């Protein structure tokens, strides 16, 4: 009759088991920062516009203390104008041990590509109305009072490109702000011997009604 119910011999229990390990696995995602979301938009250099497309591969944001150096985001970024596709990684700003100004970061080879002078970081962050409304020796004092960076409308992060995706890359990085309620990405490119304040802004593209997952062993 009902085979998969009459034949159920899996041992069901209800007692508080040995240590509860179900939680503290900080693999937190976001409504729009899921591991398959797509974004499309334009990058404005000078007065020319190029089309850009971003596909997210993995996302694991930390909900608590995070001394690990694993990337917070990862994806593919394609720029047309022929088409150049690159693999990029990303680190989010969580107000402790990953603060705004690049001095507060660690002295590691992994984190040494996302770094610049604090004055440059100020003059690049200050162009975001979210950054302005959220408030170099004053930020250090007032950032410690911020709590629960994930429970906020805007999330700030840095994007760096590592290599090219078909058979593995410009050496700058993006200041990025993500709007959690409308899913808009806005960023600026930075390099030392480059132009000044190159634009970037993206919108969700969105299948996409059903879910499927993976998990690293």
């Amino acid at each position: 009759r009902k085979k998969y119910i009459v034949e159920d011999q899996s041992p069901y229990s209800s007692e508080n088991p040995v240590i509860v390990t179900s939680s503290y696995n900080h693999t937190v995602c976001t409504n729009y920062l899921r591991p398959r979301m797509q974004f499309t938009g334009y990058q404005i250099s000078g007065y020319k516009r190029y089309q850009v497309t971003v596909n997210l591969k993995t996302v694991d944001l930390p909900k608590k203390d995070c001394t690990s150096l694993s990337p917070h985001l990862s994806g593919f970024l394609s720029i047309r104008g022929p088409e150049i596709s690159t693999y990029f990684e990303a680190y989010a700003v969580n107000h402790k041990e990953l603060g705004f100004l690049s001095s507060s970061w660690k002295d590691e080879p992994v984190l040494n590509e996302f770094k610049a002078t604090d004055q440059t970081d100020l003059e690049h962050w200050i162009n975001f109305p979210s950054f302005r409304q959220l408030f170099i020796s004053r930020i250090f004092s007032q950032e410690k009072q911020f709590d629960n960076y994930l429970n906020e409308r805007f999330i700030f992060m840095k994007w760096k490109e590592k290599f090219l995706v078909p058979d593995a890359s410009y050496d700058g990085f993006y200041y990025i702000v993500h709007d959690q309620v409308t899913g808009n990405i806005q960023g600026f490119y930075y390099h030392q011997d480059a132009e000044k304040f190159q634009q970037l802004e993206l919108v969700p593209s969105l299948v996409e009604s059903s879910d499927c997952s993976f998990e690293f062993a």
Binding site: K2, Y4, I5, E7, D8, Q9, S10, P11, Y12, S13, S14, N16, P17, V18, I19, V20, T21, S22, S23, Y24, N25, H26, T30, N31, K57, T58, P62, K64, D65, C66, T67, S68, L69, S70, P71, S74, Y87, E108, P109, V110, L150, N151, E152, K162, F163, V165, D167, A168, Q180, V181, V207, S209, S210, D211, C212, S213, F214, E215, F216, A217
Partner: protein
């Protein structure tokens, strides 16, 4: 061969003379053993002592002399175990007779540990009575003190055969199975050991001294977050030191199984006593203190978030590496690796042990030692074991930190040694399979199903763990691990180990358990190369991984729903004991990853090779990991497909009743059961998102809506079941969104959702604590309000 005076003359002649000792094992002089192995009552205390002394002296040979002697040596040892009866009269023997007998028993247990010893209970009862009557009442002699020390050593040598549960946490300390008839004696033994510990250690408590500062006197003991431990405590009495060490080790073995309150481990003064003992001059005392202080982290809940105690114990655990004579029951490698794995698996992204070891320069020394061990010009068993331990600890470093992954991959000569190890194991397996028939013919007469394991199994297992740790990062998967040689070696190892299981089952269970474990680890490392956005998936698919998975999953050894043939009764009997659940879980893991973000063409190819009944054979497996992986594979299969959803519906319709029972019965406090619950909910999502027919079919069911309501009513205060989990809440909101999205039946469905009371719950979740649930709930409420006009 007689004459106590002659026995003493022979002893005096034999002391220290290996050649003469060996000469007493040959044809004419073997008659002495018929007199030595026959000790009966009313012989005389002096005669019994002489016989025991002579027998111990005779049996005290070196391995290069035991090789000359042969199997007669082990026949004599087995005769001592079996045909002697001094353990039965332990409570009536003389003290010196007991001491000599236990010393001989220790020698026997050291030289031949596999022979079954049948009189352990008599010795345990004798120990209990001796301790309770003589030692604790202070009316004991030197012979009895040394006897109880020897008894403690003998009891510590026992392998003890603990229980095996495949559903317990793999990184906590394993405990021993206990029945009732053994439980009473276990309680008595634990009581005796605790009494010995208290009596001996209560003479030195007044030696505890600590001066500290609390930031916001004596007789208060206010706060102890200092990182400073008391001054050293030193036990001048050597017998007291031996008793304290051995009794505390055995009490560690025994004390978590005895129910009670106000335990000794939870004491406030004894913990400081042991912390002071960490600084002692006696290596046994220091190591026992380390074991006692580190056990709760693995045998206790919520203890892991006590990092101050770890920070004050770690310097001494690091110091313990450098002492030359270490006891046989202390391995700093295993202790350090266990701590690192504990924190790697409870709270990733934060490892107190690794940060403490990295700030104080120790990790660089460990990696330098690893490189020097790999670079040695001549190797043997000791160096191979040391290299294996170093590989394991480096894998534990790299398991959850990209910093250490890249640091280890910046060597450029490590993958060469990895491939060398894998190639050597493959060569050994190929040679064994080639010589199978001759090996069987030669060793079938006495070594029927008792054959040693291949010597390289620990080495290759450590290499495979290291590879599994490396392959966890996309940068490595796309830049430095993009070698086809590694994929070839992994596939070859899978094929060879399965062939070995199929054809060489005559070698027993000692030979085959390492092969099964290697199969599990290599599957666990393959399932990472197989995922998308990794360049080796096409290579693995071209070289036939689905075929291997199909062979492995249709085998009656792994799949219990399949019946053994009539030619395989020998295999059935030989391999019945080995546990195979990691292999099944990782096979389903690999299939799940192959089905991630693919098209119906690939889905139908995999369903053509491995049918759906075969996948459903594991839906009710007693192991939680197998069930979780089956449910996640079903999610990935039903994702964005109508044909496969129809197939799954046809296979059952009571599918919703099955899922409702699963959801009610599963326990959300288990990681694997929670994973299965998420899989079930997202199967419901993927089923609802197909057609109007499926939306109607899902909304008709009432148990599903009851479960959704129970999940959505959870809040911060009311968190009894489901733990107020944002993932489950988002899954339920996604179900509702698919039920309402895509125009006449939609409004009826909305009205039904309002009357059941889910509109109120969605409006209640707008004030949640998680932004994702808040936004999704408010958008869903807006859409319901729009359609409710």
């Amino acid at each position: 061969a007689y004459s106590l005076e002659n026995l003493k003359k022979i002893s005096n002649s034999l002391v220290g003379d290996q050649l003469a000792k060996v000469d007493y094992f040959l044809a004419p002089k073997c008659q002495i053993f018929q007199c030595l192995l026959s000790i009966e009552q009313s012989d005389g205390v002096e005669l019994k002592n002489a016989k025991l002394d002579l027998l111990y002296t005779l049996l005290h040979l070196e391995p290069q002399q035991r090789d000359i002697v042969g199997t007669y040596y082990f026949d004599i040892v087995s005769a001592i175990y079996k045909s002697m009866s001094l353990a039965s009269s332990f409570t009536k023997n003389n003290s010196s007779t007991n001491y000599k007998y236990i010393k001989l028993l220790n020698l026997c247990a050291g030289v031949y540990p596999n022979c079954g010893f049948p009189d352990l209970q008599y010795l345990q009862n004798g120990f209990i009575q001796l301790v309770n009557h003589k030692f604790l009442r202070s009316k004991c002699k030197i012979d009895e003190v040394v006897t109880i020390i020897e008894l403690l050593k003998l009891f510590l040598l026992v392998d003890e055969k603990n229980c095996s549960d495949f559903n317990k946490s793999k990184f906590m300390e394993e405990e021993r199975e206990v029945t009732e008839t053994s439980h009473y004696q276990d309680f008595k033994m634990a009581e005796s050991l605790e009494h010995i510990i208290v009596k001996i250690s209560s003479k030195y408590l007044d030696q505890i001294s600590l001066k500290y500062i609390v930031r916001l006197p004596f007789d208060n003991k206010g706060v102890d977050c200092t990182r400073a431990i008391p001054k050293k405590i030193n036990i001048s009495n050597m017998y007291d030191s031996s008793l304290l060490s051995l009794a505390l080790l055995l009490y560690l073995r025994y004390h978590y199984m005895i129910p009670g309150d106000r335990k000794l481990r939870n004491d406030a003064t004894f913990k400081m006593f042991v912390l002071g003992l960490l600084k002692s001059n006696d290596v046994n005392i220091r190591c026992v203190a380390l074991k006692f202080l580190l056990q709760p982290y693995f045998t206790e809940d919520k203890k892991w978030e006590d990092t101050r105690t770890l920070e004050k114990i770690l310097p001494y655990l690091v110091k313990s590496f450098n002492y030359d004579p270490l006891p046989w029951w202390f391995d700093p490698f295993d202790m350090l690796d266990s701590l690192i794995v504990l924190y790697n698996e409870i709270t990733p992204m934060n490892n107190p042990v690794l940060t403490t070891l990295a700030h104080t320069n120790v990790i660089f020394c460990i990696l330098s030692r690893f490189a020097q061990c790999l670079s040695l010009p001549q190797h043997n068993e000791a160096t191979l074991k040391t290299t294996t331990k170093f590989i394991k600890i480096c894998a534990s470093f790299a398991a959850s930190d990209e910093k250490y992954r890249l640091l280890l991959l910046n060597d450029t000569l490590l993958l060469n040694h990895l491939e060398y190890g894998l190639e050597s194991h493959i060569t050994l397996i190929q040679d064994f399979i080639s010589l199978k028939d001759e090996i069987k013919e030669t060793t079938t007469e006495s070594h029927s199903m008792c054959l040693p394991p291949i010597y390289d199994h620990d080495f290759v297992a450590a290499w495979l763990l290291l590879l599994k740790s490396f392959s966890r990062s996309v940068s490595a998967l796309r830049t430095t691990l993009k070698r086809n040689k590694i994929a070839q070696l992994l596939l070859q190892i899978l094929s060879k180990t399965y062939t070995l299981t199929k054809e060489c089952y005559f070698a027993g269970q000692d030979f085959m358990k390492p092969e099964i474990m290697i199969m599990g680890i290599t599957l666990g490392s393959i399932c990472n190369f197989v995922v998308e956005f990794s360049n080796l998936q096409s290579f693995m698919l071209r070289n036939g991984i689905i075929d291997i998975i199909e062979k492995m999953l249709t085998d009656p050894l792994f799949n219990s729903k399949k019946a053994w043939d009539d030619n395989e009764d020998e295999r059935r009997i030989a391999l019945q004991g080995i546990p195979v659940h990691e292999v099944k879980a990782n096979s389903l893991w690999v299939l799940r990853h192959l089905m991630y973000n693919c098209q119906n063409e690939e889905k139908f190819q995999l369903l053509a090779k491995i049918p759906m009944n075969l996948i459903l054979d594991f839906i009710n497996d007693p192991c939680w990991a197998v069930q979780a992986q089956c449910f996640q594979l079903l999610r990935n299969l039903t994702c964005n497909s109508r044909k496969i959803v129809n197939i799954l519906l046809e296979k059952f319709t009571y599918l919703f009743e099955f899922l409702a029972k699963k959801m009610r019965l599963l326990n959300p406090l288990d990681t694997q059961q929670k994973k299965a619950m998420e899989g079930i909910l997202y199967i419901i999502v993927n089923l609802a998102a197909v057609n109007e027919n499926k939306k109607q079919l899902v909304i008709e069911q009432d148990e599903i809506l009851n479960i959704m309501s129970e999940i959505l009513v959870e809040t911060t205060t009311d968190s009894s079941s489901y733990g107020n989990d944002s993932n489950l809440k988002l899954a339920c909101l996604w179900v509702l969104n698919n039920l309402l999205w895509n125009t006449r039946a939609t409004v009826e469905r909305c009205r039904k959702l309002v009357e059941v009371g889910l509109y109120d719950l969605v409006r209640k979740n707008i004030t949640d604590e998680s932004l994702s649930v808040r936004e999704k709930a408010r958008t869903l409420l807006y859409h319901m309000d729009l359609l409710l006009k």
